[model samples]
Target: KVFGRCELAAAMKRHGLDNYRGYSLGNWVCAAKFESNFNTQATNRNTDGSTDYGILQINSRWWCNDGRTPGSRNLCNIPCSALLSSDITASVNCAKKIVSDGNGMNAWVAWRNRCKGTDVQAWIRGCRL
Candidate 1:
């Protein structure tokens, strides 16, 4: 499922993304906008052969077990397939764990290239939260 901007913002907020690790909800929303365009099924393969999964694009190389990446850490202890679920619960939880691991929002190159050091508040402009 593809989410509208505010819809994604509210969903992430409900999953405790608001001010998560001192990063604004808009920061998350902004990254989702650029990373997966809020599509739950999004995936991308990196040159090194690891795949990114779901709306937040969690990496299979380190955060999830896809049974594909060599030396996969699976630090989030989750199946990469779980990240593809439309519910987004696994995606959110894994993303939080990724942040907790000290990678922060920079874990996503999309966030660095598109959302970093920018005014992301506009990403959630219409959200009531």
Candidate 2:
């Protein structure tokens, strides 16, 4: 499912991402917009052959196991396919793990380029939370 901005915001909040790892809900929403455009099924293969999965584009190399990325660490210990589901439960949980691993949402380059240190309030302006 391609989630609307506010819908995505609500979902993220429900998953406890609102202030997860000291990052605001808007930070996550903004990064997801740039990462996968809120599309749960989104996937992108990196030039090095690693693939990123789901809305936050969790990478196969260090996170999810796609069985295709060379030298995959599978740090999240989850099948990459789990991230493609629209339910988002697995993806959200794994994302929290990533942040807890000391990445702090910095695991996503899109967040660094677009969301970090920016005023992301607009990403959730109308969300009822």
Candidate 3:
């Protein structure tokens, strides 16, 4: 099973993502899926050979090394292992800060637009983390 709900909630709260609480499970699921395809260890390699890691796809080299305490690389080092730990939610919430600082809902909005008839909230619930 994935990390516990309380742990995940704590992480979200730490990073101010608790705002997403009111967001239907469907929306949360959809956002998580679109972000990392639900792969807690997902990573993307750029043309320059740099990497983005984890469900939130945090870039280790850039954000991790930029004096961000626990830097991006730190997050990438463990991959899905961290998600299973108490730090899982914290890691994800940190990722949100690095990715969009809570304002990067563009991807979510785009997804909603693309699936015109789709209920994003329902899709999120279906994914269920």
Q: What TM-score, over all chains together, does every model reach? A: 0.95, 0.95, 0.49
Worst 10 residues of 2 by lDDT: 99-108
lDDT of 3 by residue, 1-129 (tens): 243434333444455554453443344445555655655656566565555555555554544432323333554344433543334464555545443544444434433544334675445232233
- Pull out the clashing pairs in model 3: 25-125, 26-121, 26-124, 26-125, 30-124, 60-72, 60-73, 64-71, 64-72
Candidate 1 per-residue C-alpha lDDT over 1-129 given as tens digits, one digit per residue, 9 for 90 to 100: 999888888899999999989999999999998999999999999999899999999888889999989988988888999999889999998888887876788888999999899998889897787
Residues forming the 10-long window of minimal summed lDDT in candidate 1: 96-105
Q: Candidate 2, residues 1-129: lDDT per residue as tens digits? A: 999889889998998998887889999999999999999999998899998899999989888888888888987888999999989999998888888886678888999999888899888997898
Q: Score each candidate by Cα lDDT.
A: 0.90, 0.90, 0.47
Q: Which model is ahead, 1 or 3, in terms of TM-score?
A: 1
Candidate 3 ranges beyond 4 A from true positions: 1-18, 21-25, 66-87, 99-103, 107-118, 124-129
Instruction: Give the winner by lDDT: 2 or 3.
Output: 2
Cand. 2 Cα-lDDT: 0.90
